[PDB]
Amino acid sequence: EDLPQFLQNYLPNAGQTENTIVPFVTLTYAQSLDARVSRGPETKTMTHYLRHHHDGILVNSPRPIIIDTKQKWRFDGSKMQELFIKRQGKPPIVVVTSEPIIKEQHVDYAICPINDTTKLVDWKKLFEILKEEFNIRSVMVEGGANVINQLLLRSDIVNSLIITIGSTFLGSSGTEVSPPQTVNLKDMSWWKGITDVVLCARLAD
Amino acid sequence: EDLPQFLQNYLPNAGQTENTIVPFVTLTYAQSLDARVSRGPETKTMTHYLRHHHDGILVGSGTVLADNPGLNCKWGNSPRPIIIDTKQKWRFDGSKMQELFIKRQGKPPIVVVTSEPIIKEQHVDYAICPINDTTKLVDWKKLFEILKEEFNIRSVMVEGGANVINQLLLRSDIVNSLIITIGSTFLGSSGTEVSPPQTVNLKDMSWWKGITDVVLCARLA
């Protein structure tokens, strides 16, 4: 709508990550008034517009990037697998902590060593691996509220934050997005729709 | 500024002509992106403009006990403060509210209790509201009726208590307008959140946008 002009300054910017080893990282999600992303229109256009401006998407057409540290996901027999077959959808990059004994066709494996301290995955190292090993110049992370909750803390990684808020309450039992500490924003910009609003911003510090 | 017309349809006297037994009730609060109201300049003025249009301003005790709020109005007379204090632990004597009352800058409070007031304070009015036999908590419908019938409160703005908000969000038979400000900040998951226990659908929504904040006006579906 007027949405492309609104998003423009927050889209991956070529000359900004070029001659760096990190990709542009956008953090994006859709929540209710009570900050829930699940429970216990018009956003299609925007999401698909955003996706086609990124090389990878962490959950032309973007490549799917899946975290599967515990190694239990499978490509064969996935929506993704079928989409790949019909010439409209790329095969996934699968993020793991060690080399899997059994690998699937078309699937790329990114071995990211779990962080020494946090005991979680080293987000900085993972994003460099995606960029350097797999030509992923930009990445749109869409969810796992737990992924979002960690990355909200990473002002040194995240480049743009794009949040849709719908005019509804999902209820307290729904899965929330809220960082463990306070997170300040900068360079904020709001767009308003009929029933929804979108925030574009950056992470302070 | 466009804020007055934006709010116009959601204020008590856009409510047209009919006399009612229930006061007009606006549910209004300010939250972070993570729906938090407590820690873990345009909106402040709006709040005051809103206060100017209501006979009463309601808060749960706890929010009065935490922040020591004036709860009076400045131009965007003043509304009467209404404190829910079922435990009868809030004290008017020595409060900021009392300071404003003495300086003729604010009104004395109405205190809502659920049994005989034990220590009545000078210039304080007490509203004894029945307890709902199902919830064990105060009967919101009867309370608002009493505020109107006994204390001549024709309209009330409830601002405070996540706990209060969380209950009223479920009461489409009580709430006339929902007005929510959302700031562009995260307070963090330790902060106290506003989220009702069940899904709540909204209707008649209209959004307003500032530079750092957005405001939603809606009604309960």
Author numbering:
A (entry chain B): 8 to 47, 57 to 75, 98 to 243
B (entry chain A): 8 to 47, 57 to 92, 98 to 242
What does the report in the manuscript say about this coordinate set?
Saccharomyces cerevisiae RIB7 (ScRIB7) is a potent target for anti-fungal agents because of its involvement in the riboflavin biosynthesis pathway as a NADPH-dependent reductase. In archaea and fungi, DAROPP is reduced at the phosphoribosyl moiety by RIB7 yielding 2, 5-diamino-6-ribitylamino-4(3H)-pyrimidinone 5′-phosphate (DARIPP), which is then deaminated into 5-amino-6-ribitylamino-2,4 (1H,3H)-pyrimidinedione 5′-phosphate (ARIPP) by RIB2. ScRIB7 exists as a stable homodimer, and each subunit consists of nine central β-sheets flanked by five helices, resembling the structure of RIB7 homologues. Here we report the crystal structure of Saccharomyces cerevisiae RIB7 at 2.10 Å resolution and its complex with NADPH at 2.35 Å resolution.
The structure of ScRIB7 was solved using single-wavelength anomalous dispersion (SAD). The crystals belong to space group P212121, with one asymmetric unit containing two ScRIB7 molecules. The RMSD between the C-alpha atoms of the two subunits is 0.3 Å. Each monomer is a mixed α/β structure: nine central β-strands flanked by five helices which are similar to those of the reductase domain of known RBSRs. The most likely dimeric interface was calculated using PISA, and the two molecules per asymmetric unit were modeled in the appropriate positions calculated by PISA. The size of the calculated interaction area was 1,303 Å2. The two subunit interfaces are made up of the four β-sheets (β1, β7–β9) and several loops (Lβ7–β8, Lβ8–β9). There are nineteen hydrogen bonds, and seven salt bridges between the protein atoms across the interface and the extensive hydrophobic surface formed by residues Tyr36, Leu40, Ala42, Leu190, Leu199, Ile201, Ile203, Phe207, Leu208, Val215, Val221, Leu223, Met226, Trp228, Trp229, Ile232, Val235, and Leu237. ScRIB7 has a unique α1 compared to MjRIB7, while EcRibD and BsRibG have N-terminal deaminase domain. Electronic density of loops Lα2′-β3 and Lβ1–α2 in ScRIB7 are missing probably due to their flexibility.
